[PDB]
Swiss-Prot record, chains A, B, C:
Seed storage protein. Accumulates during seed development and is hydrolyzed after germination to provide a carbon and nitrogen source for the developing seedling. The N-linked glycans are not essential for the folding and assembly into trimers. It comes from the Eukaryota. It holds the Pfam family Cupin_1. The gene is CG-4. It comes from Glycine max (Soybean). It is found in: Vacuole, Aleurone grain; Endoplasmic reticulum; Protein storage vacuole. Belongs to the 7S seed storage protein family. Glycans are attached at N304. Gene3D superfamilies: Jelly Rolls. This is Beta-conglycinin beta subunit 2. PANTHER family: OS03G0336100 PROTEIN-RELATED, VICILIN C72.
Amino acid sequence: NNPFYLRSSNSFQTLFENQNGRIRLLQRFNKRSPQLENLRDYRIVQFQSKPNTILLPHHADADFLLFVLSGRAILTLVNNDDRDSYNLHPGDAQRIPAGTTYYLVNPHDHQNLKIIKLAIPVNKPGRYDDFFLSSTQAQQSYLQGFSHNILETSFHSEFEEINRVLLGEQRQQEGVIVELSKEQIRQLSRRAKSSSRKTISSEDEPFNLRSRNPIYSNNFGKFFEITPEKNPQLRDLDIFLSSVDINEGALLLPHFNSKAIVILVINEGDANIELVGIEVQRYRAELSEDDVFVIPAAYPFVVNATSNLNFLAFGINAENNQRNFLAGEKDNVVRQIERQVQELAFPGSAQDVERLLKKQRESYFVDA
Amino acid sequence: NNPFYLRSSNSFQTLFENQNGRIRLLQRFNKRSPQLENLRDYRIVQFQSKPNTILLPHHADADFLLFVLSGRAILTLVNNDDRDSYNLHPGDAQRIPAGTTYYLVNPHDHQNLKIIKLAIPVNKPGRYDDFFLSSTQAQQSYLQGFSHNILETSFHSEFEEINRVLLGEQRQQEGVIVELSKEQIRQLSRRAKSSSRKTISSEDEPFNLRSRNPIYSNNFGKFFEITPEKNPQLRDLDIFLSSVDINEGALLLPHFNSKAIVILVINEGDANIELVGIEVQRYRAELSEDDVFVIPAAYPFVVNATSNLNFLAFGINAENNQRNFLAGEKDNVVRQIERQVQELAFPGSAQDVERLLKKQRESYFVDA
Amino acid sequence: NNPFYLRSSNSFQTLFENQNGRIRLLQRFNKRSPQLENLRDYRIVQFQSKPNTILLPHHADADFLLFVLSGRAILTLVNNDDRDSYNLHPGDAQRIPAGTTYYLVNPHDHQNLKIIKLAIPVNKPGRYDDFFLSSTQAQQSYLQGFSHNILETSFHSEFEEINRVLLGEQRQQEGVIVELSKEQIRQLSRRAKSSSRKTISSEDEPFNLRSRNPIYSNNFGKFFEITPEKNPQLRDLDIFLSSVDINEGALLLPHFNSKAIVILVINEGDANIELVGIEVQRYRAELSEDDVFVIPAAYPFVVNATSNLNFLAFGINAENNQRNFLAGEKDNVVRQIERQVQELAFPGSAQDVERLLKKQRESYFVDA
């Protein structure tokens, strides 16, 4: 029983689901273990949709940091006087500020669309709600939460004309994810500003994580990372975003983040993971696809890919965070201590500890 | 039983009250219902005084944002080396940082003073204490907490002498709201820096909501707003203030705030409010003077004025908030959704939906 | 039973102890009383070590602000690619960012090293672990929490080798504080960059409190203070620091902090304290060496030095705090009230109250 490990088979909850897609909502990081109390303002959401589909317009009382894992998406935020569409390619991340009206389009003809978004609620710490303008057989419109009179007066129309057209009390769709026509998706898809190299530092438009050189790259893995220091949208939430690939056989060298609580959601592959906290204590767990693991601050952990692996991470409390590795060449903390202290720290000689710490010639990603 | 509705008749608790006025303190937002757990650090205080009165020198462990609803006050914040007097007119807001000693004078001869302040306690979340320098039949001077021994040394005098002059253990006032002499009102008034139009963006002196033009305004209402973008003192608290007037029979069209939790205080008039949440849920309540009603972020709501109405709204989590109306013409977000999305959203055409939304030729406030 | 008084003989808890020093942790501020709930995030640690000792390398899931009470010291912070050593003298203070590995050496040949540090946990509010890199009879290195397989792969080595050198499953030391060879403390002493006059506004380097002129100084007491305004480290924490010596028989005139919660620890000598909260509630207390007294924000309090006293204060939420005195000539709020409001606020004339306030002709510290 690993309180920091959430098995996707019994730790998500499906909000809506039909033949065109499903939306799933992770449970609450502190109802799992109160050790996770400082994540109580966060939730993980997973969205998947078949090709040629639309998530009907809606808003929620929560900041959204959405990241596109695979597929292509049209993200359209509607304002009161304005509108903004965006063409999302894999790797792209975008913030939906709380209570924006927005719909998602999957224009691809044969590929799905998988989005994980980080959700920070406004009203209730950890708990949020989805407001759907649309009138579906699944959900009532929140327009229906008003009275006949208040609707009549507000639309300057009698109630049948506003019922035959807005609410529909057989005429209305089956779900909050429905199919589209190609003539629609053709018309929709032409005005959507897409991600670029010059967006790595924009307060509006979506940025791509991988579009820059990783920070860690070798023949066994690559470590893409954007931090609050480079991107204003992330400075506002104080979160780093990282996508790292781990080739099968290889592993990520045991390390700890200095001050950041990391939320990693496995995207592809399998992996084992070892975490140490306090007399020491090992937190191992066997992660497959769509699972989630969370690493407390300054908690050293190893990620061991037992198949071809890519995960996404969320770094909570990400300002000025430092990754300290414990083995390998570059960015070792144990190889920076004064020699006479290394003598004193472990039962060994300065030369004898200097022997063991220099052996491993490679840094970050080694082979197993 | 509306969790978001707080009724004056049974939601307030009187901190002090005599013939000359009374300070009432609204119940904690979170004690009412855990739904409001985010406002736990906020309290609403009502202050009311009779003419030619003064509230004796005190300080709280609590930041104040005080809004003079009716009357005219002469607010004097004292510091350890300075003294500041501010002539406040109805509509004036100012901010009393916490631990600032101050007093409050009603100089008028026939009118009452009706102030409401939003309070942000420092020490214990949602709970502060008032600390009166003065020694009155209703409360000791907090200099009495100390021992006689310490008092003699600190002031360099025998205790009989300091107890005759500061504490008075019949020569003392009845309460903390005392009556005034005209000659003294004559003296205390003449130095008061008055709120201006150059002050709308000043870090000290107060600032008048109504001074600039309304954000919205037709023949059925006026919406006055002021935001952290325009005002330093408000950007600090990250709050917007708004005062809005609805004519008898008119209503504020259905709309929602994006991320701002709005504490509205009904100041004059009578309304019916309708809040919607989630399957939808109507939260209707019928409101009268001094009533309080909290609208969570991203919750749609309509204000129906059943008699000429004016309320005050505190906006919590204000920075970059957006008001999205569901009906009318200007700032309707239903009317910004792409046409092909209106086909698929509501049960009916996009010429049928384009027909309905165009009916109401007005915006913001309309007539019932 | 005063909820703001943490007696040293039953409010502390030893983390580790041996012949070479010990490390206690002050109990949770809120556990004691729910009144101290806004201190839920802060902890106090006490560090005392013998001459020519070391604290083996380690880190914590906590920010640290460590203050040097007495002794000299070498503090070494090791990064993934850098190492930095600081020479700490009495009255020096440094921030150790969360999860920064570090060790601490006492280079002096007879003097102890008393250090005290305020801690801000990053994972559990008010709760953090130490992670010791070293292998010792008292603790396991947090490398033991990885499997053999994983350990072997990472280092590139048989387990029989990484155990013989790093872990040791007799050859290992007894505690986390060990004694040192004089040539060893010699070699650790010669790169340490020391605190200066150049370092009171340096984001990296330690700063001396007593390095600048006190804010208050007279033949009975000195008052040193560094504020968020003048230091970059105390501004990201939003905290002030103060050392204040009070000669025996003197005292620190009644006063209160406008918005700072103050944690004070007594460094030497004895004081009586009186604190007033609210009808007025005195909270009196006879403090000795090592006790902690908390003053919530805006509560007036006095410190009464029964023996050549000096103490340390951590100011929580210090940005723009004002100190406000009630006796003595300078910084006297009670002297800044208008005359005619002095008439109304106490039983006594303006001539009468003016007379009694002018009597004490000194400021800040006076002879009792």
